[PDB]
Design an enzyme around this catalytic site. Structure first.
Site, mmCIF file in Angstrom:
data_model
loop_
_atom_site.group_PDB
_atom_site.id
_atom_site.type_symbol
_atom_site.label_atom_id
_atom_site.label_comp_id
_atom_site.label_asym_id
_atom_site.label_seq_id
_atom_site.Cartn_x
_atom_site.Cartn_y
_atom_site.Cartn_z
ATOM 1 N N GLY A 1 40.826 33.277 42.239
ATOM 2 C CA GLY A 1 41.307 33.377 43.604
ATOM 3 C C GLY A 1 42.331 32.317 43.937
ATOM 4 O O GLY A 1 42.714 31.515 43.072
ATOM 5 N N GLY B 1 36.080 29.327 44.112
ATOM 6 C CA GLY B 1 36.108 29.532 45.542
ATOM 7 C C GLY B 1 34.964 30.409 46.028
ATOM 8 O O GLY B 1 34.063 30.778 45.271
ATOM 9 N N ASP C 1 34.272 33.538 49.382
ATOM 10 C CA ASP C 1 34.739 34.209 50.572
ATOM 11 C C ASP C 1 34.031 33.639 51.783
ATOM 12 O O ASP C 1 34.646 33.513 52.827
ATOM 13 C CB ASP C 1 34.537 35.725 50.465
ATOM 14 C CG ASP C 1 35.303 36.321 49.299
ATOM 15 O OD1 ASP C 1 36.557 36.183 49.246
ATOM 16 O OD2 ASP C 1 34.650 36.916 48.409
ATOM 17 N N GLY D 1 35.431 39.210 46.847
ATOM 18 C CA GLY D 1 36.429 39.766 47.740
ATOM 19 C C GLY D 1 37.700 40.135 47.011
ATOM 20 O O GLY D 1 38.396 41.090 47.383
ATOM 21 N N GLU E 1 32.561 36.241 37.368
ATOM 22 C CA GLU E 1 32.332 34.993 38.071
ATOM 23 C C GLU E 1 30.853 34.669 38.081
ATOM 24 O O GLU E 1 30.468 33.555 37.858
ATOM 25 C CB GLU E 1 32.822 35.068 39.523
ATOM 26 C CG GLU E 1 34.326 35.135 39.659
ATOM 27 C CD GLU E 1 34.723 35.323 41.103
ATOM 28 O OE1 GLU E 1 34.003 36.052 41.802
ATOM 29 O OE2 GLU E 1 35.732 34.719 41.537
HETATM 30 O O1 LIG Z 1 36.440 37.769 43.803
HETATM 31 C C1 LIG Z 1 37.155 36.626 44.070
HETATM 32 C C2 LIG Z 1 36.398 35.336 44.177
HETATM 33 O O2 LIG Z 1 35.087 35.531 44.491
HETATM 34 C C3 LIG Z 1 37.013 34.257 45.024
HETATM 35 O O3 LIG Z 1 36.403 33.079 44.593
HETATM 36 C C4 LIG Z 1 36.855 34.462 46.512
HETATM 37 O O4 LIG Z 1 37.295 35.741 46.818
HETATM 38 C C5 LIG Z 1 37.665 33.411 47.245
HETATM 39 O O5 LIG Z 1 39.053 33.495 47.034
HETATM 40 P P1 LIG Z 1 40.075 32.641 47.885
HETATM 41 O O6 LIG Z 1 39.994 31.188 47.482
HETATM 42 O O7 LIG Z 1 41.416 33.208 47.543
HETATM 43 O O8 LIG Z 1 39.759 32.808 49.349
#
Ligand SMILES: O=C[C@H](O)[C@H](O)[C@H](O)COP(=O)(O)O
Ligand SMILES: O=C[C@H](O)[C@H](O)[C@H](O)COP(=O)(O)O
Lengths: 232, 232
Positions: free
Chosen positions: B35, B88, B90, B102, B109
């Site tokens: 992400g 990261g 969501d 997300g 992950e």
């Molecule tokens: O599926 C994506 C991951 O779970 C991300 O870690 C999560 O969506 C957060 O992404 P971002 O830092 O872009 O908000």
């Protein structure tokens, strides 16, 4: 009287077709399992197919067999409910918990079973065991997790064996996953083990049908078919 | 002082690289999330990459970014253990339970996180919520189970939305599965909901990281980085 295992499978397949005709109303869609015993049920169901709309199938092989009999196959997403799901098991214990997945389509079988109100297990007498686990427990795993899940299983004393095809390369499921067939477990609490394994990231499906086990089993013995019933 | 969300993501990415240099010995393999915030961490890690052997990656996108920096990527099956996984979320609640998935690679992950001893969540302040659920909960599902799982979610008051690509057809994951993004849940007991959903046949992975949540969160706020810690 002497009956072979194949004859006992035919006996319970026929008994299950009678269970369907006796308990499932005209026009219903029937949930259909996978494997040699299920194939005997398919052949018997074909004889009464005109009273049913069709079937939901738990595998490619089962779909091919249903279609060879001119039985209509519906995708599960088309079907709002199922009264019955008739399927075999690699093992079944006194609580009606089952090990399944020894052959094809572990995941699909468990999905169809999850929707059906009543799970009818059809099996010869050799499938009924005091404690599950002497038949290797299938665990469908995302390949990246193969070793992580294997280590968790080894921690329990399990011996995880990656399923291979005749040519020695890994068997891959319909969803692009591997199967670990786990030997050496003595599964005295299948509902608990099911929940533990389902909680491991990288597990797609575990071949313990325990939280949702059999509702009844038609068991083909050398003295005839026994009807066993279990609690939810 | 005024910081944009992108600036806060850079702040926590840098803080995480310092956490790694401070806590993870030379020669280690680092678990790397996915992400926009994780990408800031990747860029910061690249500056100290000579002290580490390489990385285990949680997505195709992450692997491409790591490789663009000349960081070696190891398949997880090659790696017996990981001290840290930096990723990261969501959303993250007061217990360190997270909604993830997300974007890409929900399943990968969760697998890498399952092996790592320490999960370092990197997030800007907007990710910290009182109760998980206003960000739609991703559930990866076998397609045959899409409707069965959707009905279970609707029973809970959830509004399941099949994830689609720009072209309107279903997003399909790396393992050939669909994602239902579920809206309208108010997830006051994420560990309990996680176990319930993991128990449904047809679920591959649920984007609640709760039974194994964050061990710490580096949270980028308008007043600087906060370090939050949580119990196993
Ligand atoms: O599926 C994506 C991951 O779970 C991300 O870690 C999560 O969506 C957060 O992404 P971002 O830092 O872009 O908000
Ligand atoms: O994966 C295959 C199924 O679970 C079968 O129901 C089980 O393996 C039993 O098959 P059979 O009746 O051939 O012993």
């Amino acid at each position: 009287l002497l009956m072979t295992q194949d004859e006992l499978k035919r006996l319970v397949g026929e008994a299950a077709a009678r269970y369907v005709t006796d308990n499932v109303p005209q026009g219903a869609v029937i949930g259909v399992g996978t494997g040699s015993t299920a194939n005997c049920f398919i052949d018997a169901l074909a004889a009464v197919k005109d009273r049913y709309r069709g079937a939901v199938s738990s595998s490619v092989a089962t779909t091919e067999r249903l279609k060879s009999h001119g039985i209509r196959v519906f995708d599960l997403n088309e079907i709002e409910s199922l009264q019955v799901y008739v399927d075999g098991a690699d093992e079944i214990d006194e609580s009606g918990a089952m090990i399944k997945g020894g052959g094809g389509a572990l995941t699909r079988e468990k999905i169809v079973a999850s929707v059906a109100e009543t799970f009818v297990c059809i099996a010869d007498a050799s499938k009924r065991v005091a404690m599950l686990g002497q038949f290797p427990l299938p665990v469908e795993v995302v390949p990246m997790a193969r070793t992580a899940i294997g280590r968790r299983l080894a921690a329990l004393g399990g011996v995880p064996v990656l399923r291979v095809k005749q040519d020695g390369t890994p068997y891959v499921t319909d969803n692009g996953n591997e199967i670990l067939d786990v030997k050496g477990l003595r599964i005295d609490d299948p509902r608990a083990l099911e929940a533990a394994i389902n909680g491991w990231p990288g597990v797609v499906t575990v071949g313990l049908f325990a939280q949702r086990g059999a509702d009844l089993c038609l068991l083909g013995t050398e003295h005839g078919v026994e009807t066993l019933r279990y609690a939810a």
